[PDB]
Scaffold this motif. Structure first.
Motif, PDB file in Angstrom:
ATOM      1  N   UNK A  18      -0.685  -4.886 -12.798  1.00 30.99           N
ATOM      2  CA  UNK A  18       0.223  -5.753 -12.056  1.00 30.99           C
ATOM      3  C   UNK A  18       0.890  -4.997 -10.925  1.00 30.99           C
ATOM      4  N   UNK A  19       0.915  -3.657 -11.032  1.00 31.77           N
ATOM      5  CA  UNK A  19       1.529  -2.801 -10.025  1.00 31.77           C
ATOM      6  C   UNK A  19       0.426  -2.171  -9.178  1.00 31.77           C
ATOM      7  N   UNK A  20       0.550  -0.857  -8.887  1.00 34.71           N
ATOM      8  CA  UNK A  20      -0.426  -0.085  -8.115  1.00 34.71           C
ATOM      9  C   UNK A  20      -1.553   0.284  -9.056  1.00 34.71           C
ATOM     10  N   UNK A  21      -2.315  -0.742  -9.505  1.00 34.89           N
ATOM     11  CA  UNK A  21      -3.399  -0.572 -10.468  1.00 34.89           C
ATOM     12  C   UNK A  21      -4.731  -0.277  -9.768  1.00 34.89           C
ATOM     13  N   UNK A  22      -4.731  -0.255  -8.424  1.00 38.36           N
ATOM     14  CA  UNK A  22      -5.896   0.115  -7.624  1.00 38.36           C
ATOM     15  C   UNK A  22      -5.578   1.439  -6.931  1.00 38.36           C
ATOM     16  N   UNK A  23      -6.445   2.449  -7.095  1.00 42.92           N
ATOM     17  CA  UNK A  23      -6.221   3.758  -6.467  1.00 42.92           C
ATOM     18  C   UNK A  23      -7.441   4.172  -5.717  1.00 42.92           C
ATOM     19  N   UNK A  24      -7.257   4.577  -4.449  1.00 36.83           N
ATOM     20  CA  UNK A  24      -8.347   5.007  -3.580  1.00 36.83           C
ATOM     21  C   UNK A  24      -8.064   6.413  -3.125  1.00 36.83           C
ATOM     22  N   UNK A  25      -9.030   7.297  -3.380  1.00 36.21           N
ATOM     23  CA  UNK A  25      -8.953   8.676  -2.965  1.00 36.21           C
ATOM     24  C   UNK A  25      -9.595   8.811  -1.587  1.00 36.21           C
ATOM     25  N   UNK A  26      -8.836   9.321  -0.600  1.00 33.55           N
ATOM     26  CA  UNK A  26      -9.362   9.512   0.744  1.00 33.55           C
ATOM     27  C   UNK A  26      -9.715  10.978   0.878  1.00 33.55           C
ATOM     28  N   UNK A  27     -11.021  11.287   1.049  1.00 29.49           N
ATOM     29  CA  UNK A  27     -11.441  12.692   1.083  1.00 29.49           C
ATOM     30  C   UNK A  27     -11.408  13.337   2.456  1.00 29.49           C
ATOM     31  N   UNK A  28     -11.504  14.665   2.437  1.00 31.69           N
ATOM     32  CA  UNK A  28     -11.580  15.484   3.627  1.00 31.69           C
ATOM     33  C   UNK A  28     -12.957  15.212   4.274  1.00 31.69           C
ATOM     34  N   UNK A  29     -13.026  15.165   5.624  1.00 35.94           N
ATOM     35  CA  UNK A  29     -14.309  14.845   6.282  1.00 35.94           C
ATOM     36  C   UNK A  29     -15.382  15.913   6.169  1.00 35.94           C
ATOM     37  N   UNK A  30     -16.636  15.467   5.958  1.00 31.76           N
ATOM     38  CA  UNK A  30     -17.833  16.327   5.947  1.00 31.76           C
ATOM     39  C   UNK A  30     -18.290  16.502   7.412  1.00 31.76           C
ATOM     40  N   UNK A  67       0.863  -1.167   0.000  1.00 29.92           N
ATOM     41  CA  UNK A  67       0.000   0.000   0.000  1.00 29.92           C
ATOM     42  C   UNK A  67       0.903   1.221   0.000  1.00 29.92           C
ATOM     43  N   UNK A  68       0.777   2.047  -1.039  1.00 32.70           N
ATOM     44  CA  UNK A  68       1.546   3.281  -1.143  1.00 32.70           C
ATOM     45  C   UNK A  68       0.618   4.493  -0.941  1.00 32.70           C
ATOM     46  N   UNK A  69       1.155   5.548  -0.316  1.00 35.07           N
ATOM     47  CA  UNK A  69       0.426   6.780  -0.042  1.00 35.07           C
ATOM     48  C   UNK A  69       1.140   7.975  -0.637  1.00 35.07           C
ATOM     49  N   UNK A  70       0.356   8.924  -1.199  1.00 33.80           N
ATOM     50  CA  UNK A  70       0.839  10.170  -1.816  1.00 33.80           C
ATOM     51  C   UNK A  70      -0.138  11.356  -1.648  1.00 33.80           C
ATOM     52  N   UNK A  71       0.434  12.548  -1.546  1.00 34.92           N
ATOM     53  CA  UNK A  71      -0.295  13.816  -1.464  1.00 34.92           C
ATOM     54  C   UNK A  71      -0.308  14.450  -2.846  1.00 34.92           C
ATOM     55  N   UNK A  72       0.677  14.078  -3.692  1.00 34.93           N
ATOM     56  CA  UNK A  72       0.866  14.585  -5.051  1.00 34.93           C
ATOM     57  C   UNK A  72       0.777  13.434  -6.109  1.00 34.93           C
ATOM     58  N   UNK A  73      -0.426  12.853  -6.377  1.00 35.73           N
ATOM     59  CA  UNK A  73      -0.518  11.750  -7.362  1.00 35.73           C
ATOM     60  C   UNK A  73      -0.331  12.206  -8.819  1.00 35.73           C
ATOM     61  N   UNK A  74      -0.489  13.516  -9.058  1.00 42.37           N
ATOM     62  CA  UNK A  74      -0.356  14.164 -10.359  1.00 42.37           C
ATOM     63  C   UNK A  74       1.076  14.071 -10.883  1.00 42.37           C
ATOM     64  N   UNK A  75       2.071  14.042  -9.972  1.00 40.32           N
ATOM     65  CA  UNK A  75       3.496  13.954 -10.317  1.00 40.32           C
ATOM     66  C   UNK A  75       3.976  12.477 -10.315  1.00 40.32           C
ATOM     67  N   UNK A  76       3.062  11.504 -10.153  1.00 41.10           N
ATOM     68  CA  UNK A  76       3.443  10.086 -10.155  1.00 41.10           C
ATOM     69  C   UNK A  76       3.728   9.558 -11.552  1.00 41.10           C
ATOM     70  N   UNK A  77       4.750   8.686 -11.661  1.00 41.79           N
ATOM     71  CA  UNK A  77       5.142   8.051 -12.915  1.00 41.79           C
ATOM     72  C   UNK A  77       4.032   7.102 -13.374  1.00 41.79           C
ATOM     73  N   UNK A  78       3.549   7.221 -14.635  1.00 43.08           N
ATOM     74  CA  UNK A  78       2.441   6.356 -15.092  1.00 43.08           C
ATOM     75  C   UNK A  78       2.748   4.867 -14.993  1.00 43.08           C
ATOM     76  N   UNK A  79       4.042   4.484 -15.154  1.00 45.58           N
ATOM     77  CA  UNK A  79       4.536   3.111 -15.058  1.00 45.58           C
ATOM     78  C   UNK A  79       4.096   2.425 -13.751  1.00 45.58           C
ATOM     79  N   UNK A  80       4.071   3.186 -12.636  1.00 49.69           N
ATOM     80  CA  UNK A  80       3.676   2.712 -11.313  1.00 49.69           C
ATOM     81  C   UNK A  80       2.234   2.267 -11.239  1.00 49.69           C
ATOM     82  N   UNK A  81       1.368   2.861 -12.053  1.00 55.69           N
ATOM     83  CA  UNK A  81      -0.060   2.578 -11.985  1.00 55.69           C
ATOM     84  C   UNK A  81      -0.500   1.542 -13.010  1.00 55.69           C
ATOM     85  N   UNK A  82       0.463   1.028 -13.808  1.00 50.70           N
ATOM     86  CA  UNK A  82       0.230   0.030 -14.856  1.00 50.70           C
ATOM     87  C   UNK A  82      -0.250  -1.318 -14.268  1.00 50.70           C
TER      88      UNK A  82
END
Ligand SMILES: Nc1ncnc2c1ncn2[C@@H]1O[C@H](COP(=O)(O)OP(=O)(O)O)[C@@H](O)[C@H]1O
Ligand SMILES: Nc1ncnc2c1ncn2[C@@H]1O[C@H](COP(=O)(O)OP(=O)(O)O)[C@@H](O)[C@H]1O
Ligand SMILES: Nc1ncnc2c1ncn2[C@@H]1O[C@H](COP(=O)(O)OP(=O)(O)O)[C@@H](O)[C@H]1O
Ligand SMILES: Nc1ncnc2c1ncn2[C@@H]1O[C@H](COP(=O)(O)OP(=O)(O)O)[C@@H](O)[C@H]1O
Ligand SMILES: Nc1ncnc2c1ncn2[C@@H]1O[C@H](COP(=O)(O)OP(=O)(O)O)[C@@H](O)[C@H]1O
Ligand SMILES: [Zn+2]
Ligand SMILES: [Zn+2]
Ligand SMILES: [Zn+2]
Ligand SMILES: [Zn+2]
Lengths: 151, 412, 412, 425, 420
Positions: free
Chosen positions: E163-175, E146-161
């Motif tokens: 077999x790799x980190x192909x699952x992404x979950x956005x954790x939102x600010x609380x309501x 499980x990897x965590x980032x504040x800046x996913x926009x600057x992430x290398x596309x290869x990482x999200x291909x």
């Protein structure tokens, strides 16, 4: 490898060169300098270090250079720009240093570089070594470099 | 290329004003820690610009020599992606040989795709080094008009020195310097030779004495006579008709300056080639001055006699007029809009060009009218300029004073 | 990336026609000297293009596996001036591991400044290696429409294979392949699952069975039942309304083909997405066919029912019309001039655009009239296409034969 | 990087099947290589470079090897791909060295396979070095360079200009007879049964090259061997056949009319360059300045370029004009655009030269370019319309012979009582 | 150098995590897999290898990862992306190989990579080594990264291909609810007074993260301690709150709510466009009618802004909607020949300016048509919309069903387009 030719006092003169009297007139100072460099040196005169001869293949560029050396009764050291194609390491740059070394030993003399375009289009290693060797020698040495090119 | 001193200010003839400017660079290179503990910050880059052969590389070499500091030479054309690496390496080498001087000849070749990426690498390397390093970069260019504005921005080559062509005095001093290693006869008058070579650079003069030496040697002489020097001369010099045109142009600029409503001090008229806020009137006046040279050319010689000499003044005037219209909203027609330019409609571009043409023609007609008015005292000034080559602003004003015309007090 | 076989044609389901095409590549990689002594020259580059997940990398990996040859993988996005060096190095590595296969995924990223220089380095590396080396480059792209034409020129990626989305048969075969490693129950009907997944790729199906397996595991079951598969299905499938639109479009193209004056054989109509000289009539006819799909969409659904599906056929038709006008001087108005394009006056550009619009509208009106004429037997063809997903050209002709309409003999 | 020097027999004309016309053309090359001194004393001047172009496996390297063999002269083989690098100017050195090696082994033959790889920047420096090495050697040396290409359309025009590879021979894919003759040649070393009909095999292999046929008989031999047979039966040949494109007759007629169109323009031109061998080569195969040209010379060059299309329209109508005129049209327009915007050969535009230009001038330029092209297109069309009957005759001969000599064209016109300009070779 | 942490069976569970029930539901398969990998393996199931957690700093990404490990009773191996900054040679690539080696030794376990952006923007030497290590391990190993980032926009596309980190979950600010639940969790160890209203505190903190709230209660506790009190009163909480003066203004909130409601109303009325979901103030073949409808929905936010606030109240928030709507209109005209004026010609992205003008005219026609339509719709349902906005302002997040129910109260039957 490599091969530098030395003709201590050639037999070709201006009588073997035809119809370029204007050119013959231009180069006459180069002949007069090679004949006696200290006459020039004892006045503060600085002749050209390098002279570029350019024209179509067969118009007599090597011939004119050989005639300059012959008229001055000075050795003609011939070499080709393609002979500075290094066989491992920077052996190309070493050959340049050696050519000028040989020339200084045979002074007053003439260096002739045919196909200067081959060495002057690792490429900038031999090219730069030629440039530094050109800036290395002075009028005191009593030597002149004549290069020829078709391009 | 990496060299060592062996050339000083004694090998540089004249340009004493320039020599005075660069004296802080020589004092800094001598001991940078004196300047570092001081708190003061010398320039990072210094641009040397002028015609070819005026002694830009010579001045740079003399700066290094006077300071007894290594001189690392390189040219702008010596810089596919390997161009940016060479820049990084040059500064690396420099920092290793500190205190030393970097010299970049033909900075215009690198500072006008691979041609635009090496440029940025130079800009970042300039911003990379500090005063602590104790190094200074001196760049030289023959075409500063084609230089990228980014290069002259603060922190990088924000200091610029113009090296001019030598005046009669300047030519004589250069001749003296280059005559030191020559066996000249008693009959040779270097003062005459200076007078006889208007328009030549230090390099041309050095070659003239060198050619005279080679002739005397060829001739079989133990000295160089005036014969040889005249022969070497014949073998680049300003025609008397050409001189008249230059003098009329130069007088034209000065007259505009001594009549223009506000500011900018006028100085030394010769037949040889921002932290401040300006109002609309100041800029109209600056344009007026810039068009003065050409205005004089037309008034005196006609539309067929106008010359190529007005090239920079016309460029500058137009560049200033476009800035007024498209940048400083000083046009009522265009309004207070500022366009800095591939998102702008052709209709606005037309409206801008029209207004720029309006301003220039307005001022050109004004300048022409002024030259037409003072044509007789101007003729007098040109006669003095032709005879003396160089006149003081005071001299100009005094010539006008003779014709009963009191000019504005704007000299020095 | 450098891998070894471990994947063959048994892991590739269907695409038997494609499997047959690439069989020469597998025979060449097995022993290149047989092909070298032969005199024949295999392709240097092979382009694999299709939608994401259809099995382009899989086919390439299977080619390497069947031939028992190394598989050297790389992606187009992995290629400032260092981009061109990486290309040179990849081919260097390949020649060292010969006989082997180079695989370039996302060739569109490198083959559409640094973005245009690495491209040339690839082009020169392609021209650099020969059949003697015994190596082959297979490139894959999802966007072949944005590919640089230079890449497809002779000597470089001049072979192109389109890998399509699986039909009902294709889907079942893929499901069988991916069901091998899964513990499925007796009640699971993979034939049904194929029928229930029109529009899905091999990857989607592989994920569907994987998701069903994870659900059955989460649920605490020793087998995967239809319950899990339906649940995994719900978690990309073509709507019946969407299917109707595709079927009308596809029928539209086929009808144009079976009515168009000259050449090009018509083939297999399905609800799934040069060495020759052509005359003006042939190209007008090719445009007619390309507009057929959309013409059917408008005739059947109205101007508000026309769909996004006509995107490529419209592009192709317009691209062909521009070539006729600006390249082949097939326009009387424009004449026999050929413009290949930043030296051309806007008046000529207008004249060209006008003529292109004339041709397309002419043909669109023609196509529409044809669909309007055979609307009733077309409705019949669409009903068959909706039921069977895929029909033969012969079947289409036989449906028209029932409505007493004899079509042109252009099938296979 | 290497180069392979072949010593002489093994490959002669007896190993080359069915290209007797080509064999006849190259016979002067074989005679010259035998004794270079005897043929220059006689008067015969040989080519420096001979370009062999055709599909892969069509016997281009074979013909070159047979030329060397028949002459009993060394065959120095090399590939164009061996002269590419990007890193260092070593490509240009290799070219100089190849010709050096050749001069040392004279009289000998240089063979350059894939000349297109070196003929299309470090590759440009190598291309020019080849061009200068071609201009460097003479007939005195006793060397001829034969280059082979599968892609002649992408070849640099500089390579084909006079003094270089100025002779080009198209080697075609074998027809049924051709295929049969090749099969006979490759069947000589094979033990075939009585039941095998090579005439049938020829009809059953349309589109195959000599290479494919050689392999088909080789595969059939290996299948008969692995089956345990001393002879090769039709069974093995059919099996070997399975283990592994065309040109339309209507398409052929269009090509022939286009090609005849160019030749008629050339033989009527008023002032042009030489015209040669008219042939039906497919779109895929088939293929200046330095000197001074007047306005009339360029109008004439345009006239010739439009000839192919002009014939297409005269014979087939506006709906019959084809995509084949693509390069002719481009070249003609490029030339017209140079006349107007570079050489000020337009009265309307004047003697101004455009290397930042108003759209009004661009319009004026485009108008004039359109004027020139349409003028010439109308001229070309009128010429085709005038000689439509002797042209129909030429096309009929071209369709049945697939290739006709310039001389044959002129003698067909001679039959219709029309005396053409003396061009040809 | 370097440092890899191993917590063999953590003590944080889902009880320490508040208000991300949808996220909690997603990751439940990861928990079930880590509990017993062979249950999955014995069926042919292949869970994700890598899971990317992205969100603002302090939203609970490391917390969620720690809770996943805790719920599964599996070791949690923590490491930071910045710890792969090589000190000579390629020691960065060696550390990656070693981390996965350690993980395989402690299986079934969880690898946690904080700041994955530091290693996935010699740089491609460690990055590639991570990519090969990801492709190196299988489901048989029983491990998850499980990897965590504040800046996913600057992430290398290869990482999200794949077999790799192909699952992404956005954790939102609380309501509002989220915030209150977090406050409750962090109030458990604290000695709070009876007068403290955590419900008020949650309402008073729009825009704060779980971390900000944890710090707010921690600061209030330190204030009460320094003051010499055994309990924490509202006084200390208000004092601790004041250290917040980059929050959501109530006037700003109203603008967001009107815009968001605008889009939802378009969606629940659009003729054949598809599926509306959760309205929050917190951050294939298509026919011509479908695309007109998609434009209609995109303009909805702005249409509501104008109807409610006037031409001077329209905001910068509609920036992407406007861009997207125009891009779509441009594609309809120049790519899909959906314009009668332009015809069935396609210009994919050389053109005469006359055609460019004709294209721009048609694009302007479509957008203005739809903008007028959207505005008319907002004007029509302004009263039930005001009601939705009022609910959306107090709750910060409303379900599509809740929206439809509010409209039902105003006697208006909307389209059944809520996501199910
Ligand atoms: N002007 C000339 N006068 C006499 N002989 C000439 C002349 N030009 C060329 N030649 C002859 O041509 C030959 C080639 O001359 P050369 O100097 O080698 O040519 P290039 O200019 O290429 O160096 C020589 O044998 C030389 O005598
Ligand atoms: N002001 C000067 N004083 C003395 N010598 C000068 C002067 N200007 C130029 N020279 C001489 O002319 C030559 C050319 O000067 P240089 O600095 O190289 O040219 P540039 O201004 O183009 O950089 C040098 O050998 C130098 O000695
Ligand atoms: N035709 C097919 N037969 C079997 N499996 C397939 C097929 N197409 C795709 N798959 C599976 O789907 C996955 C994705 O395929 P891939 O080749 O990587 O995608 P792409 O076509 O984008 O290059 C692979 O794991 C492969 O096993
Ligand atoms: N005309 C032909 N006659 C006999 N054999 C042929 C013929 N064409 C091809 N072959 C055979 O096919 C093989 C391939 O020929 P090759 O010379 O390599 O073709 P190319 O150079 O055109 O690629 C050779 O073994 C050759 O003998
Ligand atoms: N949703 C939440 N529920 C409970 N506490 C939370 C929540 N979000 C954050 N926190 C608290 O905030 C602190 C920081 O959490 P953390 O995971 O490190 O932030 P990040 O997302 O940057 O990794 C922890 O002490 C954690 O308990
Ligand atoms: Zn001036
Ligand atoms: Zn279609
Ligand atoms: Zn043609
Ligand atoms: Zn929005």
């Amino acid at each position: 490898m490599a091969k530098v030719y030395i003709e201590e006092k050639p037999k070709v003169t201006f009588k073997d060169v035809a119809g370029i009297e204007e050119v013959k007139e231009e180069v006459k100072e180069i002949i007069e300098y090679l004949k006696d460099p200290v006459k020039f040196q004892k006045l503060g005169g600085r002749p050209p270090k390098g002279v570029l001869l350019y024209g179509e293949p067969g118009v007599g560029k090597t011939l004119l250079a050989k005639a300059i050396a012959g008229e001055a009764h000075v050795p003609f050291i011939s070499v080709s720009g393609s002979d500075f194609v290094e066989m491992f390491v920077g052996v190309g740059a070493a050959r340049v240093r050696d050519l000028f070394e040989t020339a200084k030993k045979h002074a007053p003399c003439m260096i002739f570089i045919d196909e200067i375009d081959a060495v002057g289009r690792e490429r900038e290693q031999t090219l730069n070594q030629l440039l530094v060797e050109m800036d290395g020698f002075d009028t005191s040495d009593g030597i002149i470099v004549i290069a020829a090119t078709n391009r | 290329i990496e060299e060592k001193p062996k050339v000083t200010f004694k090998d540089v003839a004249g340009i004493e004003e320039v020599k005075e400017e660069v004296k802080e660079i020589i004092e800094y290179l001598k001991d940078p820690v004196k300047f570092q503990k001081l708190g003061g910050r010398p320039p990072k880059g210094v641009l040397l610009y002028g015609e070819p052969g005026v002694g830009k590389t010579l001045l740079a070499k003399a700066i290094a020599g006077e300071a007894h500091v290594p001189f690392i030479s390189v040219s702008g054309s010596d810089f596919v992606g390997v161009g940016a690496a060479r820049v990084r390496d040059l500064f690396e080498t420099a920092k290793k040989h500190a205190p030393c001087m970097i010299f970049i000849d033909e900075i215009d070749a690198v500072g006008r795709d691979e041609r635009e990426q090496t440029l940025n690498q130079l800009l970042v390397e300039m911003d990379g080094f500090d005063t602590s390093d104790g190094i200074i970069v001196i760049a030289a260019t023959n075409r500063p008009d084609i230089l990228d504005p980014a290069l002259l921005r603060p922190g990088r080559f924000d200091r610029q020195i113009f090296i001019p062509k030598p005046d009669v005095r300047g030519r004589y001093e250069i001749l003296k310097v280059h005559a030191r290693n020559k066996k000249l006869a008693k009959d040779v008058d270097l003062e005459f030779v200076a007078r006889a070579t208007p328009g030549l650079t230090g390099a041309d003069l050095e070659n003239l004495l060198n050619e005279a030496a080679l002739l005397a040697a060829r001739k079989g002489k133990e000295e160089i006579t005036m014969e040889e020097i005249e022969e070497a001369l014949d073998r680049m010099t300003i025609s008397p008709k050409e001189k008249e045109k230059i003098a009329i142009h130069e007088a034209g600029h000065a007259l505009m300056g001594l009549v223009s409503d506000d500011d900018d001090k006028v100085h030394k008229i010769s037949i040889i080639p921002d932290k401040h806020i300006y109002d609309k009137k100041d800029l109209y006046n600056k344009i007026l001055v810039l068009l003065g040279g050409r205005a004089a050319e037309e008034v005196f010689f006609g539309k067929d006699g106008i010359t190529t000499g007005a090239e920079n003044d016309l460029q500058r005037a137009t560049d200033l007029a476009y800035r007024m219209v498209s940048m400083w909203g000083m046009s009522d027609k265009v309004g207070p809009i500022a366009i800095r330019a591939v998102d702008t409609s052709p209709d606005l571009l037309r409206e801008i060009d029209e207004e720029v043409r309006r301003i220039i023609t307005e001022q050109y007609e004004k300048a022409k009218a002024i030259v037409e008015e003072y044509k007789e005292p101007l003729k007098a000034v040109v006669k003095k300029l032709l005879e003396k080559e160089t006149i003081t602003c005071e001299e100009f004003v005094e010539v006008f004073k003779l014709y009963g015309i009191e000019l504005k007090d704007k000299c020095k």
